[PDB]
Design a protein around this ligand. Sequence first.
Ligand code: ATP
Ligand code: ATP
Ligand code: ATP
Ligand code: ATP
Ligand code: ATP
Ligand code: NA
Ligand code: NA
Ligand code: NA
Lengths: 208, 190, 133, 133, 133
Amino acid sequence: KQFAVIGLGRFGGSICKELHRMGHEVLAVDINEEKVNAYASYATHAVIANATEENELLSLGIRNFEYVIVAIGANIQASTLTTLLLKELDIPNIWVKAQNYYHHKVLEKIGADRIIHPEKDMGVKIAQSLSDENVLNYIDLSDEYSIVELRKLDSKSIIDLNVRAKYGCTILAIKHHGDICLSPAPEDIIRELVIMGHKKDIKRFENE
Amino acid sequence: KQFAVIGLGRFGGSICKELHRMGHEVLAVDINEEKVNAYASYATHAVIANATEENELLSLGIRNFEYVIVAIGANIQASTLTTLLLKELDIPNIWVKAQNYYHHKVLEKIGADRIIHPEKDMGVKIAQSLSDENVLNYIDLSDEYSIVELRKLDSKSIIDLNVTILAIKHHGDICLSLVIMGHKKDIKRF
Amino acid sequence: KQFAVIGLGRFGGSICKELHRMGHEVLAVDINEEKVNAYASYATHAVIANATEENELLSLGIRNFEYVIVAIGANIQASTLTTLLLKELDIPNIWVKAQNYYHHKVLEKIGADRIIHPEKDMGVKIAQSLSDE
Amino acid sequence: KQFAVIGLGRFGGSICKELHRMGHEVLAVDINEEKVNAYASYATHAVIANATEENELLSLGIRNFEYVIVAIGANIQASTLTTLLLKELDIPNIWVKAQNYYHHKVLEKIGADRIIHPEKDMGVKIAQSLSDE
Amino acid sequence: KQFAVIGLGRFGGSICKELHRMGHEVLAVDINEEKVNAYASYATHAVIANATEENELLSLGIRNFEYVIVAIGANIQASTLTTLLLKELDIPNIWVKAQNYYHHKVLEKIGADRIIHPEKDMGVKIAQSLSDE
Ligand SMILES: Nc1ncnc2c1ncn2[C@@H]1O[C@H](COP(=O)(O)OP(=O)(O)OP(=O)(O)O)[C@@H](O)[C@H]1O
Ligand SMILES: Nc1ncnc2c1ncn2[C@@H]1O[C@H](COP(=O)(O)OP(=O)(O)OP(=O)(O)O)[C@@H](O)[C@H]1O
Ligand SMILES: Nc1ncnc2c1ncn2[C@@H]1O[C@H](COP(=O)(O)OP(=O)(O)OP(=O)(O)O)[C@@H](O)[C@H]1O
Ligand SMILES: Nc1ncnc2c1ncn2[C@@H]1O[C@H](COP(=O)(O)OP(=O)(O)OP(=O)(O)O)[C@@H](O)[C@H]1O
Ligand SMILES: Nc1ncnc2c1ncn2[C@@H]1O[C@H](COP(=O)(O)OP(=O)(O)OP(=O)(O)O)[C@@H](O)[C@H]1O
Ligand code: NA
Ligand code: NA
Ligand code: NA
């Protein structure tokens, strides 16, 4: 697996450092010299290049990468022309960071395999946490079912609450001072909690 | 619950639209007139103001909001001075979007209740998906346990494999009691 | 002792010249090449560096200085990030030139040992002289 | 008495606030609109004007002030032409904020009654404190 | 004799070409690289330097010139600090190109031996020709 990350910003630079940490060959490309110097130690290869130029793109041997990530999300012209070149160069997987809804529509027309909205996805997740302070993190399995990680419940056993049949929801795990429990069989004392169930049913448990 | 979102960018604008959709009173503040006009329909109140000025901050009645979100993540001076003013104004919860590690350190000194790295958090999650194409989405319960949503497994019963399987998705149908929960090392084995 | 003065302006350059005149080892740091050349003869060591970068800060042996004076008073971002790095490097004394009241509050949060208002302090003394002349 | 402060910076603004606090009639002049609005409440009269223009200077009744303080210390051209106009208008006392040694010499030639170095004077006091701490 | 012309504009460059044509040693100084290259062949010595810096002025051997012509007529700060430095280095004759009436007064205070108004003087001759044509 050889990965190319084009554009070293907050999003693109984070991908380079994480992939390099996992032990992958990463080519970091950016048009700004200061960015490339900073990430020269966090990538296998770091090049100062303009990704909108076909000659510079071919000078990098970009055809040797299965995955190319275009992490340019504030320059629509630079973002769309880069992915147009990569599609012309027959890159199998092209993942692009989109700016707005109109940028997303263009990238879908010119063939971006995956389109990413980092700030928009995080903003929705943060806004869910703001609305319900109990909700610490959640993953949306579907449009009606989700897994949500959450003093009345304190000193209460699992068998004490019958939300297993009352709400049709299952308690996946409970965190006890840095200790996790898998398949918690009642009864277990709840101290001052991961649950999977229907989205409406989960809200019922938070109420009671 | 009254929420104030300061700075209407990709991150701040997303919070305003989502909170407004859920039916909450949102005050959208931005120094750019074009941004405020765009989000005037996605907020209860939209104001063109400089959040680094105390007089403009008081003109908004910012003390009436329990939650203020400072979504300025490319202007460190504007971000840190805004949160310094809000802390001086005794706002209970101040959530700030940080730019880098040094910006994160400053905001922790001047008392930001929660510090958010939107692009950095997404970049780590995207990089996990790049490394393993099977991994579609995941939530890290701990540093050793996580829930990961994922042709050899095709036409194979659950009892056929003796490897907990939380749920399986069947053409838009979910079953309760491929989503698996287990140890991080053990998940890689599967 | 050894003094490091970061930012060679009217206030920072005046500290270097006075300390160097008194016979002290002074390290002069400025991001502007022209400033460093001017103060090369007025400092024991003059370096062109960006104080907001940790690697450049460590290249100067900044840990060897008991006193570091941050004399950037118009760039709040450069001033606050410099003293944040110096606080991390466990510098005993950090004296910073503040721009306004809000800059003073930020520096007090991030551990500036002493905060200086050169123009504001002089402006009060001049105003006192004007009133009672 | 009546004081006119031209240039609302860190040094000029500090003079206006201190004099206004003591209960004196202060005219605040600055070419920047944002500065004048900020100091509108801290001065008896705050005007947006260019002090290098004689017509704008006469529009303010600058002849009515015994003391005029020119607090422009980074623009040598604006500082020296202002005090040249004030000297022509026969202002009794003109106090000017100098930038460097050469600016001090020019102002002394064109009749600045008193020349002030805020950052340089504070930098010597700070350096004395550092040496004997 | 030896002439130094500082500032290669329409007026300064015309002096260099005419003096060099007459067979005189002319030192051409300009802060702009493009101007110096253009007048490299029209001067005995052409240097890219900032005339407001004393060290750069001494690097040129400016004390060896009896006549120095300061031909900066749109930058009052650069024009007045140059002739202030030249007056300090004891240049016998300093001829300066003035911008307006106020610039003329400043240069007369800081010891400009002769002050020239090229456009103003030509504008009067042209106006005389227009009236009586
Ligand atoms: N043509 C180009 N080729 C390569 N890199 C480029 C090009 N144009 C811009 N970049 C770089 O891509 C990076 C990301 O672009 P930019 O900063 O505009 O986007 P962004 O959406 O604000 O980023 P992020 O949110 O990830 O910080 C920057 O470092 C920029 O210098
Ligand atoms: N002082 C300020 N007061 C209010 N709003 C401000 C201020 N400074 C900037 N903003 C606004 O905040 C928003 C976000 O700022 P900016 O674009 O610098 O951050 P960002 O990290 O690039 O944002 P995002 O990634 O969410 O798009 C912009 O709409 C900008 O106009
Ligand atoms: N990141 C930096 N690292 C080092 N020096 C810097 C940095 N940023 C600015 N400087 C220098 O610090 C000096 C002082 O900064 P600045 O001119 O902005 O402040 P000031 O308040 O106007 O200062 P002064 O009143 O002392 O003249 C300048 O010479 C500037 O070039
Ligand atoms: N021609 C002018 N007329 C009036 N005010 C002016 C003029 N030129 C500049 N000023 C103002 O004078 C003030 C001080 O000038 P400047 O910022 O250049 O000096 P400084 O040495 O940095 O000052 P300080 O150290 O007091 O902050 C500024 O608010 C500036 O807008
Ligand atoms: N500090 C300086 N040292 C040397 N040369 C300088 C300096 N500042 C400006 N000059 C040069 O002096 C020349 C004349 O200056 P400028 O163009 O501002 O005046 P001017 O009145 O428009 O002149 P002219 O009418 O002769 O064209 C220019 O070539 C300019 O680059
Ligand atoms: Na962003
Ligand atoms: Na100053
Ligand atoms: Na001309």
